[PDB]
Write a protein that binds this ligand. Structure first.
Ligand SMILES: *Cc1c(COP(=O)(O)O)cnc(C)c1O
Ligand SMILES: *Cc1c(COP(=O)(O)O)cnc(C)c1O
Lengths: 404, 404
């Protein structure tokens, strides 16, 4: 017969690497805001695959774009041109108002590309001596799992046992304008990379005026402002980009995850000519980067966000989510925070009561969430969710939290 | 109306990064060994997207596996389980006879993972002091475009202007057993990563007995043998793995590209428990890594290679390709080399006659190939090609080469 949920866990334990400890649930089907496990049980998805399925699971428009293009052409590599890439590039650049886009597949690849961009620009344009270029990062950052990505992490889980590490990466505190200003005194600094809201750090929202201060400081000291919007971008926080909230324009913008609706690994690096064209032909690429199949689903994934006004929906419904969560007792829930539908709660963890245990009972009551820490639960459902669906989910959260 | 080929070039020039200089051809459709441009012209594909489409463009079995799964579930992330991953993991591990597999998306990600694996094992098992671990690479290597990947490159195009670089990466000559044996005297060396045939270096085939000498040297000095079979793997060279030719078993095997049939970015890192389980939960991952959609197409892509005996076909037909190419005049074609259907010719380049010009006239006569250097043309068509189709393609090569 068909495998049970425990059979699925057992099999992955035996034949799969041990690099995750997931919440025990075995999903076989997903549609919109809902997921179904192998036993048939229905759940509210309050993770959205880390904001990869902002448009909901298997959004018909994006599915059709995939199914259409697979019968035509899926991969020529970039050694030749394909008919689709140029259409996507024009679309996404005019959408976010940058000269050009460099297509990659995963989020970390977009970040790796941004580092190479910043460095190359730093040497060939800013005039930094080779190879003295620095890139500043904020403590609590997360932009992937490559050797370079974990070299700028302050999380021991990411970097411990994986050294030696990438030089030229400096770390300052997040949400700290004086600390940035101090760091940018060094003229060898080529760029500052930062998340408008830190996701994995636990939905850490910086004070109002931070993003504007960052922009101001960067421009002043001729330093590139890299905005990592792989998680916070694409309507998740209530706007096209989280930096739109302070009308800020970064030099480089990184997109990923929701850029495909969870149907294909597609990421993007947006910036203007004087930055982008520092990389000459043959000096960068990726086999699957810019393939026609990924492009069709990306166009469709972006069209869904615009057509269905999901940025507006995320903003209105987020307010309701946060206002209802703040009604929970202070001695149980310490804090509520976020923008739009990227939210998180902090719980008063004890030795015998933690975020994992809360998420297990959440699962039991029909809602899937992941703890990002022993005392932090993140709540981020797809942006297609309706208000009645949200309030039902809120009642499941209230029931579960108070049941302890 | 629909864009012309020149329109497609123009558009990408304006709105796309300048990180490639492709052969001027605008493909909109592909099926098996053939590609069609926007003007309707038919071409023999003698690149196979860098061996990503070993099974031919849009192979119906793989297309069906994709179309089927997209209606079900495409991405939960690894925060939860999905029903498909465990099935794929069991399949691929039993196929290549390793305990476990760690799933990633792109080829460079598989390599990045192998470095982290080798380092972690080196510290936690071998006993190397943190962080003194080294990884040896062969000159002329290519395993992607991350900061770490270009740090071990000997190609100035890859690394120039992108420093400072990753420490703990040492470089020795390819196809050099004494040079390896010298390098492994240092007990801080955790691993040696190498391609059984160097692809991007120009299909550089090492002398017989090299892979066996590498295995012997590694075992002796307690060093991990990493085999990068992202390009040479999966029937391309005539066997499941290029190392099968010398009955060698690496400690870590890297797969990619053809693992999906060009329908999805899927890569793999195969190794046993004592290496794999050095990475504990939460110490590594990727958002899209191991997603159910990529898994279904990967299973189907592997089933095609086996069912249609494409390794056998690549071996027989490759011989014919090389034997026919060697008939070309010595003063025009310097050398012919390769294994199976991964082949390349070296031409007697002059100032006014080069590999690019040869490929342009190739394109004109209905065959698509890319030069890997001013004097090297690579010939690698999909493994589904038939003998009559091959010989037709050979006549186009003879016609073009001799026409100068
Ligand atoms: C998830 C994430 C990434 C990395 O995405 P991957 O596809 O897993 O490599 C990078 N930056 C941010 C802000 C992210 O949330
Ligand atoms: C092409 C290639 C890679 C890179 O794969 P990507 O998916 O483009 O990152 C790595 N190793 C070898 C041997 C390759 O041929």
């Amino acid at each position: 017969g068909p495998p049970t949920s425990d059979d699925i866990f057992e099999r992955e334990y035996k034949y799969g690497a041990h690099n995750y400890h997931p919440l025990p649930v075995a999903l076989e089907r997903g549609k919109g805001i809902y997921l179904w496990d192998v036993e048939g049980r229905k759940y509210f998805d309050f993770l959205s695959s880390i904001s990869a399925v902002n448009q909901g699971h298997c959004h018909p428009k994006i599915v059709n774009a995939l199914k259409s293009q697979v019968d035509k052409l899926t991969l020529t590599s970039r050694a030749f041109y394909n008919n689709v890439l140029g259409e996507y590039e024009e679309y996404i650049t005019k959408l976010f108002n940058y000269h050009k886009v460099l297509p990659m597949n995963t989020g970390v690849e977009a970040g790796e590309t941004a580092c190479k961009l910043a460095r190359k620009w730093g040497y060939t344009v800013k005039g930094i001596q080779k190879y003295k270029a620095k890139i500043v990062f904020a403590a609590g950052n997360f932009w992937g799992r490559t050797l370079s990505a974990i070299s700028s992490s302050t999380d021991p889980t990411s970097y411990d046992g994986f050294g030696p590490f990438m030089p030229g990466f400096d770390i300052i505190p997040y949400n700290d304008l004086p600390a940035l200003e101090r760091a940018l005194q060094d003229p060898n600094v080529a760029a500052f990379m930062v998340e408008p809201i830190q996701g994995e750090a636990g939905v850490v929202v910086p004070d109002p005026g931070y993003l504007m201060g960052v922009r101001e400081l960067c421009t002043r000291h001729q330093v590139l402002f890299i905005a990592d919007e792989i998680q916070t971008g694409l309507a998740r926080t209530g706007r096209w980009l989280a930096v739109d909230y302070e009308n800020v324009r970064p030099d480089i913008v990184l997109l990923g995850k929701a850029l495909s609706g969870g149907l294909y690994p597609v990421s993007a690096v947006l910036c203007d000519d004087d930055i982008m064209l520092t990389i000459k032909p043959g000096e960068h690429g990726s086999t699957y980067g810019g393939n026609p199949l990924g492009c069709r689903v990306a166009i469709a994934a972006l069209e869904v966000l615009e057509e269905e006004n999901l940025a507006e929906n995320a903003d209105k419904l987020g307010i309701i989510l946060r206002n209802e969560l703040m009604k929970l007792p202070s001695d149980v829930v310490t804090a509520v925070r976020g923008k739009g539908l990227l939210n998180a709660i902090v719980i008063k963890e004890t030795k015998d009561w933690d975020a994992w245990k809360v998420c297990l009972r959440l699962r039991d009551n029909g809602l899937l969430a992941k703890p990002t820490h022993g005392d932090i639960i993140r709540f981020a459902p797809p942006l297609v969710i309706k208000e009645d669906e949200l309030r039902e989910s809120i009642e499941i959260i209230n029931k579960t939290i108070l049941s302890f």
